[PDB]
């Protein structure tokens, strides 16, 4: 009778499965639009990342404060991991629509109140803050309010970080303090409260003052967060669906008018059709219109019926739920100053049903789109999913839940789906999220506490420079030379040619035609066998290489031998190998004169071995050919070392106090006496002790390409076994030596790269790493290479200020010729070191010329000098 | 039958289609590795963008110089559109391998000389620079050398912009100058010289000193370039295929030894198996091994044979193409050998195997290129442009390739087109385009310069406002004045109305508690009659009281009426003119209180205030120093507290009165026409109120988008945007709403996002289109902000001078959707006020509650007067 004419009147608020399924297809399209990098800014449904990546583990423990803000009751809670305590606090409408300062002032006063009450005012606890509004966050411990919704409207919060505003409020008091703050939306918090009981909970649903839902989406579909691994909770903010007009064929004149009367007009239009803040008024407006048209109350209207907000959603609930539902309808209408007729009262009851059945069916529509998406993500033929729910409408309306459960299960019949009702509220799930924020905060702090040991301050680097300086004196003084770590070895450096370059990445033989300088070469591999074997086999091979090269070259010539190891030179052509370094370990060579060994090996098969030089010395000469001022050699490659022009007065191991001689410092051994043990870490010790030459080349082991990877690797390994990286499992391939080679350290730290890019390279090296594992590894490397650069820089600082003090000069212009694969591949080493020298040696103007022709050119030039000498 | 003894020994050098197919599957994977943003950094095949989006067009014309560098012959050319003239110049081996400076001086010299040859030295011509090496570029007119390859090794060039280096070379001369330089790989130039002849040319191949190919790829697959519209030529740099060891089961021990003796060890590993620089030496290394194992020449080995580079690629070519075996004898003999007729048979076969693997390796990677182009299109009729010594000169290389590849990709109609003019022709074509783009950009900039105002220009606008402010305040001049300086007569529970902004509101203000409801004003009413409008207004007022639960109760009402009104008192205001979009009949010239009262009769108006004035008061409720009101929304206007002795239209010289400036009409006497552009004129002349509100029309949110749109239309029809296509949607008034203008200019948006916003508006845009649109909006909103600042600067300095102060501290209350939505307007105006009015310390307070609050507060101070 009345029932069937209300249904014809409100025909367009009674929604078929056909239109419901259409609505959910549109919503789906809005989900994708919101998640896409390029369409997201134009998206009504914002699909906001939350950085909640999982439901609880069960490993969460701790004591927490919480706040629950945005629903019908503002609540301050205390949670232990579950023991909970809470108290509801009132927020006056004038504060709800006052200044942010006022708002957060209030929250902070309430919080203080509660801490006193529980007697914890002096504890500094972490805080799980449920903030039921759309927020921009790039991590758990921040959230920038995008927009207020519902009945909030404080000036100056929108665009600001609610964690900062609340801290600032607290610190305007001094009363108390808090630790880390994690911020979750209420949908997220509710998912987390429920997933605490059923870890399969993947959706969070709120039907209360407003309506919204989050869900767990695949990271590969979340364009706005770098990463493709696993899932992350997306707060959809679905209340703003249709804010672009997408549901105008669904919206009626009554929704339009609710909108015209709203605090946030134009906005949250889907919500305005569903949520409890709006439902009662929707029904007041349907009644008012019907009464103006003379279809109810015989065309009469009280002023209470016309007065906004007078018909409550509580009244919808009550009317639809009381056993005398007609009598309850009558009771409400009489509080509105009417005398309705049994007929009127059946119409009123029926509008309540129509209004609230649409609310349930709209949610069903969009929920059905989210379940379909989740079904496609899992790949599975029919799906299993748990939705966690809170809110006054779902909890208190007598039928909403049922209608929702039914409508959904019909719209998606290939779904198995359990609805869990939240009993404890969002604060619990918000404590679970802060469990993790805290953990992550703590692990980070632990990682940088370790990496702080590998960071040196200006003053530590002045001290490293000073120590280098007293070690330089020690090895130059003949009185102390035998006992010195830094040997400061006299080099005796004061046509067509052959050259050898032995001891870096490549062994080359070279033809160096001087007239300018024309250079040829061939690289010759030295097999692991020969390299591990006897002096005879090595030099046999060297000679075999020379012979091949002469044929290759279509050709007996004078020879400059670049031999990049510590040698005692008694003259330019007698060099005795003190010890092998780097990776060389051939027998019957140390303590022998390598020219003899070479000559012996040539006899077996002749040539004119005129000079033997270190790579530093060869590189200095290659570079000084371009530049009068080049007085120093530096190598930063496989090993590291430096030579420079010392004064003969200071070179006590060579008779003569006039003129100059180049000194090969062999600085890699700096620290072999203990003189750097306060700067050395447990990782430097591990690299040293597990090396071929333990207790030796300690400086170089902190600097050079052969060793950094191993500093890094030993660190990464330490972190993982402390649970701070790689989910705590030590890949048997991280147990593997030498994986972190100069190329894959210089790449990882390139700053033209983005993070997935860096992740690409780590992936590519055969270590399986998340974007989180990869920012760590990248920092561990940046740190190890920065220290290397700076130590090298402090060593060099020592060298330039020495040359300057040796000449009594007040300032020094000088060039340093440089080579080595680390120096020339690594994005920052070169600059960090040049910067370090600039800071630590102010009275020196050092220029670093990178060698483009290798040591073999400069070796050719000292041989050519030696030759002209002996003629 | 050495022929079969050779094949079993050189077995891993004879490639079955099974291993060519694998190679191509691998190469396709490396193609996708290099194109992908996350994997590009570590891709061995770099897949480098060239910024060539198209083969020639017939639209190319001009006189270009050209350089051709990195092949066997360095050339300088002159191209006119085709007439060509060229000269080859030697680059010595010590210069090729000397220093950057030295290499570039030499190129500068040879250029200078060529210009003397052709007598064309006075000229400043653009130049197409074919530079045959891997280069990073983000535009046609730059190229940063990634790495030397082949025989080059000049220091101080890797990492630098070869256009910058060549420029420093020429100015170190002074001898001459050049215009715009565009740089292309030689694959790209070779694709482009053939594309002039055949416009279906989509690949560019080079098999010569080195080997490399480029192709037209879909922009949607080029992650490394922002955009997905159309295509772009990608310089694959496939010579480096295998550099990460991805071909180490194909590569042999000879390929390894070639690499150990090369200038660039470990790089260009795929090239080293193919190209001419390497093929002769490859064959020599095979002869030298076989001889050593006593398999040829009875193991008797000459020094020539053992000497690097004595077996040339010309020797391979000659042998395969002349009696194969008498030519091999002759060559082997020249290398000091004494060959049997069997040795001569091996040698000739070795040559075949090595030159056939070369062609086959190319076919395999080229197969994959064609499959990819197939998929892109959706079906395959492609032309390949080719060049390089090995292809041009060697007898069977081309045919081996055409066969191997046409066999490898069966569903394909692939014309191979040999280039006879060389890269320079196609590089001049690309340069034609670079020049054009430079020119179009220069035209656009020149236009927008008209909307950019200097500090001095803005001081002049401030000054001119100052004089119109005086003009309007004075009784002797006020009837002439465009800036009207209207006296406002501003010195429990209330109603308010808020009319003339984006939303019409009725309010209940409880003295502060505020409620409101928006009511729509349909087009019927908007362009209807005064009677219908006020009837509507009164229907809404009546609705509101019911809604607010006080039906028919008579409250004192504050009417915010956002139009120029002569106020004879607070409760008597005569509408001078409609502005913005209002147009109801029989209203202008009438007392809006009377028209209100009348429509009430058909079913207590204490005060009528402008929105600037209500906003001044809404804001002053919380800040004593707020004595100015500003609106930048649909329109723009300001009001402020004047000294009664300055207000000549009101008798009295004591105290202060608010003056509603109605500054939107500044310029209606012609006083800004030197700052007004053709697009301002157009916006005015197609407005409802032509000739009126001219200042406002350069500032406010109803108009700014129409100025933008007009600039975009002018650019478009001038060929400078949207491919000169005037999208029909572009012709739709009002599309550039304030929310979109604000969004477009956000510093958060990547460019693909800006573009996405425009396609949402309904405008088809390339990323390059979006660059231009964002800038035009940026320039227009910046001028708007700045003009507003010049205006406010006048007003605040005025309040100071009026009180003989030397420093003023003052708040401005502000409202309007442009002011509050736009990312930079607020800031840019505040800055401008700061710069133009330095003796004043101006704070701007944003109204949170709308004009209605202020209007109700004025009313409450009215209701006080009369008690
Ligand atoms: O608006 P209502 O009915 O209070 O429902 C939503 C609220 O429900 C509460 O149970 C939760 O703790 C809140 O986080 C949530 O916002
Ligand atoms: O150890 P690396 O990386 O190969 O670099 C150092 C070597 O670099 C080469 O460039 C020099 O020619 C060698 O003399 C030197 O030993
Ligand atoms: O290296 P080659 O054999 O000269 O072949 C490739 C060259 O061929 C020429 O014809 C082109 O004009 C050059 O741009 C290109 O470098
Ligand atoms: O034209 P807009 O953008 O709506 O802004 C101006 C309007 O802003 C409203 O907020 C004010 O209350 C009105 O009085 C004013 O006219
Ligand atoms: O409180 C329930 C929902 O209300 C509104 O939709 C809010 O904007 C949203 O953040 C929240 O989840
Ligand atoms: O390769 C550079 C350096 O490596 C090692 O440290 C050698 O000991 C040293 O002599 C050499 O200069
Ligand atoms: O000249 C042919 C090719 O030679 C080398 O491979 C260059 O790296 C490449 O850029 C060029 O196209
Ligand atoms: O709304 C702001 C301004 O818009 C228009 O310029 C009106 O002329 C003016 O009265 C108003 O203050």
Author numbering:
A (entry chain A): 17 to 97, 105 to 517, 526 to 546, 552 to 591, 595 to 644, 648 to 913
B (entry chain B): 17 to 97, 105 to 345, 347 to 403, 406 to 517, 526 to 545, 553 to 644, 650 to 913
Provide text from the study.
For in vitro biochemical characterization of the mitochondrial conformation, a variant lacking the MBP, the first 16 amino acids of the N-terminus (Δ16), will mimic the HK2 conformation on the mitochondria. Only the Δ16 variant of the WT-HK2 crystallized in complex with glucose and G6P at 2.45 Å. The crystal structure of human HK2 is a homodimer with two structurally identical N- and C-halves of equal size linked by a long eight-turn linker helix-α13. Similar to the overall fold of mammalian hexokinases, the N- and C-domains have an identical α/β fold that is conserved amongst the hexokinase family. Each domain is distinctly folded into large and small subdomains that each contains a five stranded mixed β-sheet. The active site is formed by a cleft between the two subdomains, where their β-sheets enclose the active site and the helices α5 and α13. The N-half of HK2 is linked to the C-half by helix-α13 that protrudes out of the active site of the N-domain. Helix-α5 that is perpendicular to the linker helix-α13, carries the catalytic residue D209 of the N-half. The glucose-binding pockets in the N- and C-halves of HK2 are identical to other members of the hexokinase family, with the requirement of an aspartic residue for catalysis. The catalytic residue D209 or D657 of the N- and C-domains, respectively, forms H-bonding interactions with the 4-OH and 6-OH of glucose, and a lysine residue, K173 or K621, align the γ-phosphate of ATP with the 6-OH of glucose for its phosphorylation.
Hexokinase, the first enzyme of the glycolytic pathway, catalyzes the irreversible rate-limiting phosphorylation of glucose to glucose-6-phosphate (G6P). The elevated rates of glucose metabolism, tumor progression, and the high patient mortality has been predominantly associated with the overexpression of HK2 in different cancers. HK2 is predominantly co-localized on the outer mitochondrial membrane (OMM), where its translocation is facilitated by an increase in the cellular glucose concentration. The mitochondrial translocation of HK2 not only gives it preferential access to ATP required for its function and relieves feedback inhibition by G6P, but most importantly, suppresses apoptosis.
